[PDB]
Amino acid sequence: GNVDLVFLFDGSMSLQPDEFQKILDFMKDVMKKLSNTSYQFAAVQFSTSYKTEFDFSDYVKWKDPDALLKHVKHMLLLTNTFGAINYVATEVFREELGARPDATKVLIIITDGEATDSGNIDAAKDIIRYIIGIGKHFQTKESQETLHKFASKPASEFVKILDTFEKLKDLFTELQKKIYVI
Numbered sequence: 123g124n125v126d127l128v129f130l131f132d133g134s135m136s137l138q139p140d141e142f143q144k145i146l147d148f149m150k151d152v153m154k155k156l157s158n159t160s161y162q163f164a165a166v167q168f169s170t171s172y173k174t175e176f177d178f179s180d181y182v183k184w185k186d187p188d189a190l191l192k193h194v195k196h197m198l199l200l201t202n203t204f205g206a207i208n209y210v211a212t213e214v215f216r217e218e219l220g221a222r223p224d225a226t227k228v229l230i231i232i233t234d235g236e237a238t239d240s241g242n243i244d245a246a247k248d249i250i251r252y253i254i255g256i257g258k259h260f261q262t263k264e265s266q267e268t269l270h271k272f273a274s275k276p277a278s279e280f281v282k283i284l285d286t287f288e289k290l291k292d293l294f295t296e297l298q299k300k301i302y303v304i
C-alpha cells in the first residue's frame with residue numbers, strides 16, 4: 123500500500139542548463155500532485171558519481187519539493203546508469219534514509235544518453251523500474267532499445283522516449299490522467 127519512489131536523474135555534461143532545470147521541475151510537479159498520499163520520495167542525481175539530493179526522511183519532515191531540490195548542483199560528467207541503479211538499490215532503499223521496509227519500491231530513471239558503464243542490475247530486481255529517455259540522443263530505435271535493460275518489462279509500459287525536454291510538461295499532463303482513488 124505504501125510506495126517509496128526514487129527519482130534517479132541524469133546530470134551528464136550533455137544536458138544544457140535549461141534541460142537539467144526542466145527535469146528538476148518535472149520531479150517537483152509530480153511530488154506536489156502526490157502530496158499527502160501513501161507516496162514518499164527520494165531524489166538521486168547521477169553522472170559519473172551518485173548523490174542523494176534528499177531522502178525519504180527529508181521528504182516526510184519538510185514535504186516541500188522546492189526546498190528539497192534547492193541545493194542541487196549539475197554534475198556535468200558521464201552517465202553511469204548501471205552504477206546509479208545499483209547505488210539506489212543498495213544505498214537509498216534503506217531505513218537509515220527513511221525507506222519503509224514493506225513498501226512497494228518504485229524507481230523513475232530520467233536520462234538523455236546511453237550508459238557509459240557496464241554490468242548488471244540484479245540488485246534492483248525487487249524494484250518496479252520506469253525509464254524516461256529524452257532528446258536527440260534517442261532518435262534511433264537502437265538507442266531506445268538500449269534503455270529496456272534498465273526498466274521493468276514490458277518496455278511498452280515502463281519505457282518512455284521524449285523528443286524534447288519541453289515534452290516533460292506533456293508527460294505530466296498524461297500522468298495526471300492516470301491518477302485514481304482506488
Ligand SMILES: O=C(/C=C/c1ccc(Sc2ccccc2OCc2cccnc2)c(C(F)(F)F)c1C(F)(F)F)N1CCOCC1
Pocket residue numbers: 125127152226228230250252253254279280281282296297300
Ligand atoms: O506509482 C506508480 C507509478 C508512477 C509513475 C509511473 C511512471 C512515471 S513516468 C513514465 C515512465 C515510463 C512510462 C510511462 C510513464 O508515465 C506515463 C504513464 C504512467 C502510468 C500509466 N500510463 C502512463 C511517473 C512519473 F513520475 F511521472 F515520471 C510515475 C509517478 F509520477 F507516479 F511517479 N505506480 C505504478 C506501479 O505500482 C505502484 C504505483
